[PDB]
Structure 1
Amino acid sequence: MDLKVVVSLSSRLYTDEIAKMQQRIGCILPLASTHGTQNVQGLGLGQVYSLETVPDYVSMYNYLSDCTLAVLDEVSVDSLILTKIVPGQTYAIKNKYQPFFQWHGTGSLSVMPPVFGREHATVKLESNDVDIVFPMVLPTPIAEEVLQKILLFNVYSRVVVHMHLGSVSYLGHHYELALPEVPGPLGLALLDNLSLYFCIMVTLLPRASMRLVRGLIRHEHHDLLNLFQEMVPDEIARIDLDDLSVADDLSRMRVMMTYLQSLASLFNLGPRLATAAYSQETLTATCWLR
């Protein structure tokens, strides 16, 4: 099987843009089509992420799940070549991303809209008067942390604690990320579906576990319990006044675990990469699409 997409630039390319693109060899890039040759429009995440002030991250996710994925291997003047990522093949994906997230041994990678700025992960192509930006590829737990930090800033916007939320923290370094103000109707639709999920959670949640944790806060102190500050919440008081019954609890848990799988799939936006055998000395990982 031959996976080689040559993208002919419609104009030339200066040496500074060539030297800037040549540093980003091995980084994941999306494509418009899956065909043999393509033009430069549609390449990268730049067609949905215009040169504006306002971002929208969930629309870039809806782009990224829609489009295909490719890795940048050869860039020349007037033409640069890409290697597609089709499910079923196994690829060597190098860690050539500037906010250096250290990768786990046989963990799971995850592509991402550029959360650390437009100017950070981009190449300015004045010659073809377009912009190619590069989607971030970070491991899946830190990706979940970034996604939930974005949603938490989306919900806390009508309240205000900012730098305690607007900066991700990793063992390599803690990083700031760009915080928009409104995701339009799509981020609010994602919050709508997650609001449905959360409200139906607080409908069907069991009561014996609250009766566990109310006495348990009074019994034990833990790092799972320090955030309550040794104060049982009042909802635990005004729900635990009822009795305990195991039959309705098993009826409740048969919908709890039924809904939590779909809630887990409400965070699988953006395609996911399953990696293996990442060497920390060559910064590449034998990885394939999940």
Structure 2
Amino acid sequence: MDLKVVVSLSSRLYTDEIAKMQQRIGCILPLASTHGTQNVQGLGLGQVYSLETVPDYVSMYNYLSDCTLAVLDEVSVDSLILTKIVPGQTYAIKNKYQPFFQWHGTGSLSVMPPVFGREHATVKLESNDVDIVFPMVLPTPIAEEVLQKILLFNVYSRVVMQAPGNADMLDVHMHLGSVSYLGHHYELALPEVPGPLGLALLDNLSLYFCIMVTLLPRASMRLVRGLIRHEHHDLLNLFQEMVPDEIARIDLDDLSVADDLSRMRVMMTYLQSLASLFNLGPRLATAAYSQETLTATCW
């Protein structure tokens, strides 16, 4: 019923950083505990993200999800005041993030670890020797895409460690490092070495794939074979007139409807669970938006 958190500073912050904090007024940051008076150490995403360490994104997502989320409300020399985002309360939320992806009533928002830039996200508090790292919020369509770019990098860079030639490194940096949004190209920092949680996440993704290939329906594969040759689509542009070797070998067996029906049934069951693997975080359903005021209504 009462959503109020005040963060008490041990010492006065300097007149320069008090300016920077005020610029972040109205931006979500995660707090450690659900109490009235919180210390600055639990505050922010800093403890898990350190400038010395290589960024392990998968680990960051887990920490962010478990922490309580709060909206910055008031910045003073002595204290910071923040209201907390409980599950059942409607909030007015502001889109003041400097990368600035526009919002619409369409999608639920998604809170993400600071992919675009480490330094852009952090405000340093040298007065109390703590660094405050604000996460990023994005529309889920763009956020889902970003997560996909990150994981595909860890598995390819594992192969592109083959040190086989230059060409491999360039292509991967294309189509993965960059997110293309209208009128701009926003680069995503990619860790030189792949973080362990991400690899351990794909090991779970991989298990589903092993089970899934057997379940694939023959009729669907057969339709594509004749489909690519006789007719043209934008969807089929990956497959030129050329037909993949694997489909020809798998497709040789004669079709049975009782088989595909039983195949499609079990596979559909498996697909539903995948939806749990992908989100990796908390979402805010947006029911209204105001382009002039940049104020949405989350939930």
Q: TM-score range by the shorter chain?
A: over 0.9
SS of 2:241's equivalent in the other structure is: coil
Cα distance between partner residues in 2 of 1:30 and 1:88: 17
Aligned to 2:20: 20
Cα distance between partner residues in 1 of 2:268 and 2:11: 55
Q: CA deviation at 1:164?
A: 2.3
For normalisation by structure 2, the TM-score amounts to 0.93
Cα distance between partner residues in 2 of 1:127 and 1:219: 70
Aligned to 1:282: 293
1:169-207 per-residue CA deviation (whole Å, 9 max, x = no partner) reads: 122532101101344332111100000112222121111
SS of 1:228's equivalent in the other structure is: coil
Q: CA deviation at 1:106?
A: 4.0
Cα distance between partner residues in 2 of 1:175 and 1:30: 25
SS of 2:186's equivalent in the other structure is: strand
Cα distance between partner residues in 2 of 1:253 and 1:181: 40
SS of 1:169's equivalent in the other structure is: strand
Q: CA deviation at 1:260?
A: 1.0
2:154 corresponds to 1:134: no
Which deviates more, 101-110 or 38-47? 101-110
Cα distance between partner residues in 2 of 1:222 and 1:52: 49
Cα distance between partner residues in 1 of 2:238 and 2:251: 20
Q: Give RMSD over aligned pairs.
A: 1.2
Contact 2:107 2:141 in 1 (8 A): no
Gaps of 5+ in 2: 161-171
Which deviates more, 30-39 or 267-276? 267-276
Cα distance between partner residues in 2 of 1:64 and 1:205: 36
Cα distance between partner residues in 2 of 1:118 and 1:206: 45
SS of 1:93's equivalent in the other structure is: strand
Q: CA deviation at 1:53?
A: 4.3
SS of 1:162's equivalent in the other structure is: helix
1:240-269 per-residue CA deviation (whole Å, 9 max, x = no partner) reads: 111111111111111121111111111121
Q: CA deviation at 1:225?
A: 0.4
1:123-172 per-residue CA deviation (whole Å, 9 max, x = no partner) reads: 01100100000000001011111000001111110333312211011225
SS of 1:120's equivalent in the other structure is: helix
Residues 158 and 183 from structure 1, CA distance in 2 versus in 1: closer, same or farther, beyond 3 angstroms? closer
Contact 1:154 1:181 in 2 (8 A): no
The alignment covers a number of residue pairs equal to 288
Contact 1:28 1:69 in 2 (8 A): yes
Cα distance between partner residues in 2 of 1:198 and 1:170: 31
Q: CA deviation at 1:216?
A: 0.2
SS of 2:137's equivalent in the other structure is: strand
Cα distance between partner residues in 2 of 1:180 and 1:203: 34
Residues 172 and 134 from structure 1, CA distance in 2 versus in 1: closer, same or farther, beyond 3 angstroms? farther
Cα distance between partner residues in 2 of 1:187 and 1:211: 35
Gaps of 5+ in 1: none
SS of 1:110's equivalent in the other structure is: strand
1:67-108 per-residue CA deviation (whole Å, 9 max, x = no partner) reads: 110111111112000110001000011001111111122421
1:37-90 per-residue CA deviation (whole Å, 9 max, x = no partner) reads: 100001111111112240111111110121110111111112000110001000
Cα distance between partner residues in 2 of 1:230 and 1:200: 30
Contact 2:144 2:279 in 1 (8 A): no
Cα distance between partner residues in 1 of 2:242 and 2:78: 66
Contact 2:115 2:188 in 1 (8 A): yes
Contact 1:65 1:270 in 2 (8 A): yes
Contact 1:106 1:278 in 2 (8 A): no
